[PDB]
């Protein structure tokens, strides 16, 4: 008897056990194999890492050291893929991307 | 005596301290992150449930999660997520 939770055995930080419990209680299938929460926790951890790193870079080019939802909106809306995933998603207190159409500028 | 709420705010902070050691996060941004992880979880899990139901199978395996990631996520995002899931499953079934 001992240690070694399933996240540490898979080298992750997202909980494999909690994801397995949510997959079991979420009424998705009759059975859940014990590789599906590992894959699922890995995918969620990768997506969280990508969004958090892009938002940290957006905060870093803002002379700031704390991520606000504006930085998350700037990270998501500046990417083709990410915007596509979260294209029908509203972020609270995120604002919009700063853009003006070129015909509105004076000349 | 009221019951406790659970979220991803502890693990998301761990991933943040991996990818950015000297960078904090606000509570509103943590709420955005929790909503994001929940939304992607429901999307992938529902997609994989539909994949298992179409093929007359009764279990969700890592193959169903891989196909759901391929269907849901766009190109290079899906490629790197498949890479991460494959590496984690290979690492998990070795100990």
């Amino acid at each position: 008897a001992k240690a070694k939770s399933r996240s540490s055995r898979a080298g992750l930080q997202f909980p494999v056990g909690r994801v397995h419990r949510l997959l079991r209680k979420g009424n998705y299938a009759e059975r859940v194999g014990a590789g599906a929460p590992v894959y699922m926790a890995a995918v969620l951890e990768y997506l969280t890492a990508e969004i958090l790193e892009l938002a940290g870079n957006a905060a870093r080019d803002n002379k700031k050291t704390r991520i606000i939802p504006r930085h998350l909106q700037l990270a998501i809306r500046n990417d083709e893929e990410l915007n596509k995933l979260l294209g029908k998603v509203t972020i609270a207190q995120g604002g919009v991307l700063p853009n003006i159409q070129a015909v509105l500028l004076p000349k | 005596k009221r019951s406790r709420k659970e979220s991803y705010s502890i693990y998301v902070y761990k991933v943040l301290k991996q990818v950015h050691p000297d960078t904090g996060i606000s509570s509103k941004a943590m709420g955005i992150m929790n909503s994001f992880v929940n939304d992607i979880f429901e999307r992938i899990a529902g997609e994989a449930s539909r994949l298992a139901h179409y093929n007359k199978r009764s279990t969700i395996t890592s193959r169903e999660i891989q196909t759901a990631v391929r269907l849901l996520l766009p190109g290079e995002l899906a490629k790197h997520a498949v890479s991460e899931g494959t590496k984690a499953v290979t690492k998990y079934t070795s100990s």
Partner: single-chain antibody, 226 residues
Framework: EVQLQQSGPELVEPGTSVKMPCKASGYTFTSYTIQWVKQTPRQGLEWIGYIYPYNAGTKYNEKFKGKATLTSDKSSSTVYMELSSLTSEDSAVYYC?????????????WGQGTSVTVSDIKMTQSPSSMHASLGERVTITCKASQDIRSYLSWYQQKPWKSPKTLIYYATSLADGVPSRFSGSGSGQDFSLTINNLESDDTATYYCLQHGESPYTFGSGTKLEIK
């Protein structure tokens, strides 16, 4: 499938400007950044900049700001580079390279390289050149200056040819690369291992970081067979 078409060699007198196109085909053009690097005999490969056609977002090297400008044409699926005020040390091979907006991804596909002829993290590679037989094991070290969280890539370049991507994310194999090449290491210490060689491994090998804002290439290791 993915092609990065370019122009021929441009002989240019000093003082004027020069244009280089990067007509791209085989993929969704707006979803991938186009990055420009230059190569000289004197100092090797160095990263000039990039242009993201999704929002036309540019980012240049600090030593190439003003010297080089980048534009994109979405209708023709082309990326244009302007170099202005060509001095004497501007005769170089200019490469454009596809790279995804994902941080893990690297310069996977390259252009042919336009030869222009005019009338920070330090990369330390310990072996400058080495010789090997037809079946032994080669190890190339790429100790870096600062900390990069596994954001290192390994490239193979034939003479008078575009560089070929071997390793991305410091351990992962590129598309079509066999399992003889193996990347290893993390943090500051990285290495590339060739398991058993062929006659096609006579090439120059480079390591590139993209963890920081200015991307820096390696010094280059020449590998000559028998």
């Amino acid at each position: 499938e993915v092609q990065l078409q370019q122009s021929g060699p441009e002989l240019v007198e000093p003082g004027t400007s020069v244009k280089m196109p990067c007509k791209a085909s085989g993929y969704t053009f707006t979803s991938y950044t186009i990055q420009w690097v230059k190569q000289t005999p004197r100092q090797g490969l160095e990263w000039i900049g990039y242009i993201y056609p999704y929002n036309a977002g540019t980012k240049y090297n600090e030593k190439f700001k003003g010297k080089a400008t980048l534009t994109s044409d979405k209708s023709s699926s082309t990326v244009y580079m302007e170099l202005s005020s060509l001095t004497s040390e501007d005769s170089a091979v200019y490469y454009c390279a596809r790279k995804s907006s994902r941080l893990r991804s690297t310069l996977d596909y390259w252009g042919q390289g336009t030869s222009v002829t005019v009338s920070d993290i330090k990369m330390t590679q310990s072996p400058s050149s080495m010789h090997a037989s037809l079946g032994e094991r080669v190890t190339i070290t790429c100790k870096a200056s600062q900390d990069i969280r596994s954001y290192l890539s390994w490239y193979q370049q034939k003479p008078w040819k575009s560089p070929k991507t071997l390793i991305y994310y410091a351990t992962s194999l590129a598309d079509g690369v066999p399992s003889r090449f193996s990347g290893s290491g993390s943090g500051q210490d990285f290495s590339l291992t060739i398991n058993n060689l062929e006659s096609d491994d006579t090439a120059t090998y480079y390591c590139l970081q993209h963890g920081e804002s200015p991307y820096t290439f390696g010094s280059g290791t020449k590998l000559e067979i028998k």
